[PDB]
Scaffold this active site. Structure first.
Site, PDB file in Angstrom:
ATOM      1  N   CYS B  46      -3.619   0.749   4.508  1.00 13.50           N
ATOM      2  CA  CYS B  46      -3.042   1.555   3.448  1.00 13.50           C
ATOM      3  C   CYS B  46      -3.361   0.869   2.116  1.00 13.50           C
ATOM      4  CB  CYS B  46      -1.503   1.661   3.641  1.00 13.50           C
ATOM      5  SG  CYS B  46      -0.582   2.405   2.304  1.00 13.50           S
ATOM      6  N   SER B  48      -1.435   0.262  -0.188  1.00 21.14           N
ATOM      7  CA  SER B  48      -0.417  -0.742  -0.483  1.00 21.14           C
ATOM      8  C   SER B  48      -0.722  -2.126   0.058  1.00 21.14           C
ATOM      9  CB  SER B  48       0.938  -0.299  -0.009  1.00 21.14           C
ATOM     10  OG  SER B  48       1.365   0.909  -0.590  1.00 21.14           O
ATOM     11  N   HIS B  51      -2.960  -3.645  -2.388  1.00 21.74           N
ATOM     12  CA  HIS B  51      -2.191  -4.017  -3.561  1.00 21.74           C
ATOM     13  C   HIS B  51      -1.622  -5.382  -3.460  1.00 21.74           C
ATOM     14  CE1 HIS B  51      -2.500  -0.149  -5.382  1.00 21.74           C
ATOM     15  NE2 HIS B  51      -1.380   0.438  -4.917  1.00 21.74           N
ATOM     16  N   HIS B  67       1.723  -2.616   7.493  1.00 20.36           N
ATOM     17  CA  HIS B  67       2.995  -1.929   7.652  1.00 20.36           C
ATOM     18  C   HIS B  67       2.881  -0.537   8.289  1.00 20.36           C
ATOM     19  CE1 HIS B  67       1.171  -0.510   3.969  1.00 20.36           C
ATOM     20  NE2 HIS B  67       1.887   0.593   4.132  1.00 20.36           N
ATOM     21  N   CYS B 174       3.268   5.339   7.826  1.00 19.68           N
ATOM     22  CA  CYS B 174       3.252   5.289   6.362  1.00 19.68           C
ATOM     23  C   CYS B 174       2.617   6.495   5.741  1.00 19.68           C
ATOM     24  CB  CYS B 174       2.701   3.960   5.854  1.00 19.68           C
ATOM     25  SG  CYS B 174       2.804   3.996   4.017  1.00 19.68           S
TER      26      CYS B 174
HETATM   27  N1  LIG Z   1       5.789   5.897  -2.245  1.00 21.90           N
HETATM   28  C1  LIG Z   1       5.507   5.379  -1.046  1.00 21.90           C
HETATM   29  O1  LIG Z   1       6.339   5.293  -0.111  1.00 21.90           O
HETATM   30  C2  LIG Z   1       4.117   4.989  -0.734  1.00 21.90           C
HETATM   31  C3  LIG Z   1       3.198   4.786  -1.738  1.00 21.90           C
HETATM   32  N2  LIG Z   1       1.861   4.488  -1.551  1.00 21.90           N
HETATM   33  C4  LIG Z   1       0.974   4.433  -2.672  1.00 21.90           C
HETATM   34  O2  LIG Z   1       0.315   5.674  -2.791  1.00 21.90           O
HETATM   35  C5  LIG Z   1      -0.966   5.448  -3.473  1.00 21.90           C
HETATM   36  C6  LIG Z   1      -2.076   6.115  -2.722  1.00 21.90           C
HETATM   37  O3  LIG Z   1      -2.282   5.438  -1.478  1.00 21.90           O
HETATM   38  P1  LIG Z   1      -3.600   5.790  -0.635  1.00 21.90           P
HETATM   39  O4  LIG Z   1      -3.754   7.267  -0.489  1.00 21.90           O
HETATM   40  O5  LIG Z   1      -3.581   4.896   0.575  1.00 21.90           O
HETATM   41  O6  LIG Z   1      -4.714   5.253  -1.639  1.00 21.90           O
HETATM   42  P2  LIG Z   1      -6.253   5.571  -1.924  1.00 21.90           P
HETATM   43  O7  LIG Z   1      -6.760   4.482  -2.773  1.00 21.90           O
HETATM   44  O8  LIG Z   1      -6.936   5.932  -0.655  1.00 21.90           O
HETATM   45  O9  LIG Z   1      -6.223   6.943  -2.753  1.00 21.90           O
HETATM   46  C7  LIG Z   1      -6.061   6.944  -4.194  1.00 21.90           C
HETATM   47  C8  LIG Z   1      -7.031   7.933  -4.794  1.00 21.90           C
HETATM   48  O10 LIG Z   1      -6.874   7.950  -6.201  1.00 21.90           O
HETATM   49  C9  LIG Z   1      -8.148   8.193  -6.790  1.00 21.90           C
HETATM   50  N3  LIG Z   1      -8.056   7.676  -8.159  1.00 21.90           N
HETATM   51  C10 LIG Z   1      -8.107   6.401  -8.634  1.00 21.90           C
HETATM   52  N4  LIG Z   1      -7.941   6.390 -10.013  1.00 21.90           N
HETATM   53  C11 LIG Z   1      -7.881   7.713 -10.385  1.00 21.90           C
HETATM   54  C12 LIG Z   1      -7.711   8.406 -11.644  1.00 21.90           C
HETATM   55  N5  LIG Z   1      -7.619   7.697 -12.792  1.00 21.90           N
HETATM   56  N6  LIG Z   1      -7.614   9.711 -11.601  1.00 21.90           N
HETATM   57  C13 LIG Z   1      -7.707  10.433 -10.494  1.00 21.90           C
HETATM   58  N7  LIG Z   1      -7.889   9.842  -9.244  1.00 21.90           N
HETATM   59  C14 LIG Z   1      -7.947   8.509  -9.220  1.00 21.90           C
HETATM   60  C15 LIG Z   1      -9.105   7.430  -5.922  1.00 21.90           C
HETATM   61  O11 LIG Z   1     -10.486   7.800  -6.173  1.00 21.90           O
HETATM   62  C16 LIG Z   1      -8.514   7.584  -4.537  1.00 21.90           C
HETATM   63  O12 LIG Z   1      -9.206   8.617  -3.812  1.00 21.90           O
HETATM   64  C17 LIG Z   1      -1.075   3.942  -3.627  1.00 21.90           C
HETATM   65  O13 LIG Z   1      -0.626   3.528  -4.942  1.00 21.90           O
HETATM   66  C18 LIG Z   1      -0.134   3.394  -2.589  1.00 21.90           C
HETATM   67  O14 LIG Z   1       0.288   2.080  -2.880  1.00 21.90           O
HETATM   68  C19 LIG Z   1       1.338   4.597  -0.287  1.00 21.90           C
HETATM   69  C20 LIG Z   1       2.173   4.817   0.758  1.00 21.90           C
HETATM   70  C21 LIG Z   1       3.677   4.771   0.617  1.00 21.90           C
HETATM   71  C1  LIG Z   2       6.996  -4.997  -1.751  1.00 19.45           C
HETATM   72  C2  LIG Z   2       7.300  -3.488  -1.741  1.00 19.45           C
HETATM   73  C3  LIG Z   2       6.089  -2.613  -1.360  1.00 19.45           C
HETATM   74  C4  LIG Z   2       6.284  -1.159  -0.928  1.00 19.45           C
HETATM   75  C5  LIG Z   2       4.952  -0.409  -0.785  1.00 19.45           C
HETATM   76  C6  LIG Z   2       4.968   1.046  -0.380  1.00 19.45           C
HETATM   77  C7  LIG Z   2       6.098   1.864  -0.929  1.00 19.45           C
HETATM   78  N1  LIG Z   2       4.989   1.077   1.070  1.00 19.45           N
HETATM   79  C8  LIG Z   2       3.977   1.396   1.865  1.00 19.45           C
HETATM   80  O1  LIG Z   2       2.835   1.735   1.477  1.00 19.45           O
HETATM   81 ZN   LIG Z   3       1.555   2.321   3.156  1.00 14.73          ZN
END
Ligand SMILES: NC(=O)C1=CN([C@@H]2O[C@H](COP(=O)(O)OP(=O)(O)OC[C@H]3O[C@@H](n4cnc5c(N)ncnc54)[C@H](O)[C@@H]3O)[C@@H](O)[C@H]2O)C=CC1
Ligand SMILES: CCCCC[C@H](C)NC=O
Ligand SMILES: [Zn+2]
Ligand SMILES: NC(=O)C1=CN([C@@H]2O[C@H](COP(=O)(O)OP(=O)(O)OC[C@H]3O[C@@H](n4cnc5c(N)ncnc54)[C@H](O)[C@@H]3O)[C@@H](O)[C@H]2O)C=CC1
Ligand SMILES: CCCCC[C@H](C)NC=O
Ligand SMILES: [Zn+2]
Ligand SMILES: [Zn+2]
Ligand SMILES: [Zn+2]
Lengths: 374, 374
Positions: B46, B48, B51, B67, B174
């Site tokens: 993922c 994250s 990150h 995770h 996730c």
């Molecule tokens: N809220 C939560 O519980 C969770 C949050 N996250 C977060 O969600 C986000 C996405 O995760 P994934 O899908 O695994 O990531 P990913 O990196 O696969 O997808 C992100 C997408 O954003 C695009 N991108 C980058 N900069 C851009 C911009 N300026 N404008 C438009 N598109 C842009 C990329 O080209 C990429 O396809 C991450 O920040 C991750 O940490 C992920 C899972 C849980």
């Molecule tokens: C240290 C907190 C990180 C939480 C990351 C995101 C919300 N969880 C899974 O992608």
């Molecule tokens: Zn995740």
């Protein structure tokens, strides 16, 4: 007898920011198609009118301000179908056209015909109905109620009950409805919840009334003027806190008081810092914070989006979320049925010509609503 | 045969920021009371986890990250009632203790036992079950799935269907659940609505799937990498837009394409600027914008609260708003009944030992989810 004729009357004109209002002889043109000319009966002094003076709210000057009012229709222009001469009315600072995408949406109220987003200070047709010594004077929010007579677009007026007391129900034109709706419609306060209300002026007191109506168990009022607390408790606050009394930030105090954050918070002041404080003091996973106050023009706030990621909801609204033309008449009917009280908001009554005294009262901290009478 | 014994196994240890994972021998203690030791079967990569490597997301180092996973219970500590040896399970990065004010709330899911808000990188008891090179190694989100074996608290694991395909359903741990739930639970997307999804990685694709399940009429994918668009359309996007193709800012482009703003927008990237863009592009009076992406540690965004005062709602969520232990088994059952698809998210499969190649595939833009098999 005045129908189709120019009316000469008195109005309070704001010629310059940071100056007193000037009582002037003005000419009020007759209403054109789909316009309504109203004889004013009562108008409240709202902090938003003060924001025009202070430069917090930008609108074109010179202006006739005032937007919280009630009056009697003097005459109607061609094609008007929703009011008649002699009707009691409340002008609507947020219109309800009934045809735009917002008016058609079940939840939306910020009709696309508003003069709030990009103020022009005119009628819908882009012209003014007011002159002073041959100089056009701008309108304010399509209402302009600091005048003996005004002209508004039909989408900006609601007919109300023939028997209603205009010196009280003017508040339904702004402050009461805004605060009450922000609680009951926008936040959707739940029974047994804990609420925090930042700002205990007329709008904030109306938020408290709405939280009480919704069955909140705890309503915490927050204000830096402790003189506001007695009235807040009268209308339903269970506790009041003055941030100045504490050696720690009030968001921490409220989080501790609420055993981990409030269910609903409301910013009813108009400061950026209190907007962020009110967001932070709601519970991180399920809290809701509603922005009601209007901050200084063009200023951004700074905040950490982790406040939202954990689960908070942040929203704002105009006029308590109420669709204005539908809702105002129903709120007046509810008032007449004793569903809520308006007298706790009214601290002073003055004749219109004493407008500046009314503003001095607001600015000193001494009043909630002054009602100006004609 | 390993019950009650330290296990020596391989794990991917992150010793420092901005370095490759080190695959090396670790020691995994047996589970203490109310803990569960799991043999990993599959884990996804993922953003994250990336990150953590970059320092966007701060957690104590050295650490065993990971995770998003599924495995089989090797042994249980004293008092465990909800899983047994041999059960298939998904570790829960957001726990569900069942007892705290959030767990008891109908809408909350960010259990107060989480290790996200102020990470300690431990078990619930404040200690670690991992040793490497004679040193204690931190846990990650109470999960730590980049290891042949891990130990989790019972509130951080859910029993799933015995017939579940673990190499697919790890994504329910996730990315799938987060995006899907952000649409169906947090935003509550409505039939016939217009949605905009910023970021078309695994989480954003899952948001699309949720918008489609909810009956959205239009789903506009937004990504600066046009290679993402084909898959976004396969899973439900009706249009895709690359901000780099337009002279106007994308919020303007989206407001125009949607005849005045979208019903629902989603930030699924993790950038401050796109959070504000996504908020702006939703309709000013009734739009809803959900933050899903995680932005860089400790940084604030700047925004004008007029965006909220008109009527927008802004919210965020962890894990799609799902109460984790209740929801994960149901999501697995739904997957087994083919109510949603996971294969479109899986672009690459690698053995665990090739973890660093998996992270390279993510960083280069080539993958959606790489699944690592043990
Ligand atoms: N809220 C939560 O519980 C969770 C949050 N996250 C977060 O969600 C986000 C996405 O995760 P994934 O899908 O695994 O990531 P990913 O990196 O696969 O997808 C992100 C997408 O954003 C695009 N991108 C980058 N900069 C851009 C911009 N300026 N404008 C438009 N598109 C842009 C990329 O080209 C990429 O396809 C991450 O920040 C991750 O940490 C992920 C899972 C849980
Ligand atoms: C240290 C907190 C990180 C939480 C990351 C995101 C919300 N969880 C899974 O992608
Ligand atoms: Zn995740
Ligand atoms: N969203 C909408 O549709 C509407 C918004 N407004 C806005 O709502 C706000 C409140 O209006 P009124 O009640 O008429 O104003 P008001 O001035 O009577 O009340 C504001 C209260 O805030 C308190 N206060 C000021 N600074 C403070 C601080 N730093 N911390 C804590 N308390 C503080 C004051 O002591 C006062 O009692 C104004 O910004 C006004 O423009 C009003 C009506 C409609
Ligand atoms: C220039 C727009 C001002 C609107 C002020 C406030 C929302 N209305 C009534 O107090
Ligand atoms: Zn309209
Ligand atoms: Zn007002
Ligand atoms: Zn809990």
């Amino acid at each position: 007898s005045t129908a189709g004729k120019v009316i000469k009357c008195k109005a309070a004109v704001l010629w310059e920011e940071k100056k007193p209002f000037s009582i002037e002889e003005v000419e009020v043109a007759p209403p054109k198609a789909h316009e309504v000319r109203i004889k004013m009966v009562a108008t409240g002094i709202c902090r938003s009118d003060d924001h025009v003076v202070s430069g917090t709210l930008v609108t074109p000057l010179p202006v006739i301000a005032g937007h919280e009012a009630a009056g009697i229709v003097e005459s109607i222009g061609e094609g008007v179908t929703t009011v008649r001469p002699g009707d009691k009315v409340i002008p609507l600072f947020t219109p309800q056209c009934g045809k735009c995408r917002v008016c058609k949406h079940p939840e939306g109220n910020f009709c696309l015909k508003n003069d709030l987003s990009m103020p022009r200070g005119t009628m819908q047709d882009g012209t003014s109905r007011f002159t002073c010594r041959g100089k056009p004077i701008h309108h304010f929010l399509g209402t302009s109620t600091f005048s003996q007579y005004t002209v508004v677009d039909e989408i900006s007026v609601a007919k109300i009950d023939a028997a209603s007391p205009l010196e009280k129900v003017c508040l339904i034109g702004c402050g009461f409805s805004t605060g009450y709706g922000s609680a009951v419609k926008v936040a959707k306060v739940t029974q047994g919840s804990t609420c925090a209300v930042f700002g205990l002026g007329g709008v904030g007191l109306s938020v408290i009334m709405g939280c009480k109506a919704a069955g909140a168990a705890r309503i915490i009022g927050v204000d830096i003027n402790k003189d506001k607390f007695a009235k807040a408790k009268e209308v339903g606050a269970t506790e009041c806190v003055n941030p100045q009394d504490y050696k720690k930030p009030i968001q921490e105090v409220l989080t501790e008081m609420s055993n981990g954050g409030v269910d609903f918070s409301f910013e009813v002041i108009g400061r950026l810092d209190t907007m962020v404080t009110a967001l932070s003091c709601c519970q991180e996973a399920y809290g809701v914070s509603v922005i009601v106050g209007v901050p200084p023009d063009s200023q951004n706030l700074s905040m950490n989006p982790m406040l939202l990621l954990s689960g908070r909801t942040w929203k704002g609204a105009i006029f308590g979320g109420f669709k204005s033309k539908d809702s105002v008449p129903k709120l007046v009917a509810d008032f007449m049925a004793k569903k809520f009280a308006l007298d706790p908001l009214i601290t002073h009554v003055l004749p219109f010509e004493k407008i500046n005294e009314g503003f001095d009262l607001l600015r000193s901290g001494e009043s909630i609503r002054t009602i100006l009478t004609f």
